[PDB]
Design an enzyme around this catalytic site. Structure first.
Site, short mmCIF file in Angstrom:
data_model
loop_
_atom_site.label_atom_id
_atom_site.label_comp_id
_atom_site.label_asym_id
_atom_site.label_seq_id
_atom_site.Cartn_x
_atom_site.Cartn_y
_atom_site.Cartn_z
N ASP A 39 13.16 -2.50 36.79
CA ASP A 39 12.13 -2.03 36.28
C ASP A 39 12.28 -1.51 34.70
O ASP A 39 13.39 -1.31 34.69
CB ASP A 39 11.14 -0.91 36.85
CG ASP A 39 11.51 0.35 37.08
OD1 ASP A 39 10.84 1.20 37.14
OD2 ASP A 39 12.81 0.40 37.09
N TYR A 68 12.85 0.59 31.44
CA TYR A 68 12.90 2.18 30.89
C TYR A 68 11.87 3.03 30.94
O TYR A 68 10.82 2.71 30.38
CB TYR A 68 13.85 2.26 29.66
CG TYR A 68 15.25 1.57 29.54
CD1 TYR A 68 16.20 2.07 30.36
CD2 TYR A 68 15.57 0.63 28.66
CE1 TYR A 68 17.41 1.27 30.28
CE2 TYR A 68 16.77 0.20 28.46
CZ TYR A 68 17.74 0.47 29.39
OH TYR A 68 19.13 -0.11 29.14
N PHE A 74 17.01 -3.84 30.01
CA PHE A 74 18.23 -3.21 29.55
C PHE A 74 18.13 -3.02 28.04
O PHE A 74 18.99 -2.25 27.50
CB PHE A 74 19.52 -3.75 30.15
CG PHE A 74 19.48 -3.79 31.48
CD1 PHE A 74 19.39 -5.06 32.20
CD2 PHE A 74 19.78 -2.52 32.20
CE1 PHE A 74 19.32 -4.92 33.78
CE2 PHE A 74 19.59 -2.45 33.51
CZ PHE A 74 19.60 -3.68 34.17
N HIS A 132 23.02 -2.24 40.16
CA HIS A 132 22.53 -1.91 38.94
C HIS A 132 23.33 -0.96 38.04
O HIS A 132 24.05 0.04 38.53
CB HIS A 132 21.14 -0.89 39.13
CG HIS A 132 20.30 -0.93 38.08
ND1 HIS A 132 20.28 0.00 37.29
CD2 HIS A 132 19.16 -1.59 37.78
CE1 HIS A 132 19.29 -0.14 36.26
NE2 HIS A 132 18.46 -1.09 36.81
#
Length: 223
Positions: free
Chosen positions: A64, A66, A77, A187
């Site tokens: 999901d 930031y 990202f 992740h």
DNA sequence: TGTATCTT
DNA sequence: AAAGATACA
């Protein structure tokens, strides 16, 4: 000119009238009234604005957006200048330095360079409540991002799906594992990175697969 | 204090 | 469901 890129809108607009999507958009609107929600509304669908949908070759799928201020901008990202790369992105950069011989830290966190080359930078869930990771899960986004993956699965060949984290990996079942190439690892968040992301070599492996299929590789330095 | 995953 | 336990600044 609007939130969805034209080619993406054409092939995903069938979702708009569905009950889950109306309830999803309603939920986000209500959240925005009482909390700070990321990314801003105009940047939720940035992942549709970088290349035509038919030119997608690689899909990076994260969890999901930031959940800190001025970070998320609709590409997984990625952070727009002058925002410093968050810990997750520094980890991505660390892997790239060992994986890709010529790669050096670019001095910023904007991953638009990759997206323009046909790397879809998608998250499984597309909004988030400030300071609360995965707070907008199980609200309708999963079904929508399923529709993204499913369209690509059906209309493309030899795609490279990079599924980072448990939540991204939920989409693995919708991908033809022989027709496309699914690579799965932890992740890149510091909380999970040590569980396989470091040393996963996804970036070099991706290009190996692409070059084998006669496609142009991703220039991971091109940012 | 801050940045997932497993288990219950 | 949702919360407790579990590398490095």
């Amino acid at each position: 000119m609007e939130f969805f890129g034209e080619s993406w809108k054409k092939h995903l607009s069938g979702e708009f009238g569905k009950p889950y999507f109306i309830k999803l958009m309603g939920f986000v609107a209500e959240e925005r009234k009482h909390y700070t929600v990321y990314p801003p509304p105009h940047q939720v669908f940035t992942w549709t604005q970088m290349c035509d949908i038919k030119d997608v070759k690689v899909v990076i799928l994260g969890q999901d957006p930031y959940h800190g201020p001025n970070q998320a901008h609709g590409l997984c990202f990625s952070v727009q200048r002058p925002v410093p790369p968050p810990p997750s992105l520094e980890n991505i950069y660390k892997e790239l330095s060992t994986d890709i011989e010529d790669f050096v830290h670019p001095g910023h966190g904007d991953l638009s360079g990759w997206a323009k080359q046909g790397v879809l930078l998608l998250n499984a869930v597309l909004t988030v409540r400030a300071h609360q990771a995965n707070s907008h899960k199980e609200r309708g986004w999963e079904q929508f991002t399923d529709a993204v993956v499913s369209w690509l699965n059906q209309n493309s060949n030899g795609l490279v799906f990079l599924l980072w984290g448990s939540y991204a990996q939920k989409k693995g079942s919708a991908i033809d594992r022989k027709r496309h190439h699914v690579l799965q690892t932890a992740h890149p968040s510091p909380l999970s990175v040590y569980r396989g992301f470091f040393g996963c070599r996804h970036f070099s492996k991706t290009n190996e697969l692409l070059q084998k299929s006669g496609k142009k590789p991703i220039d991971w330095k091109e940012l």
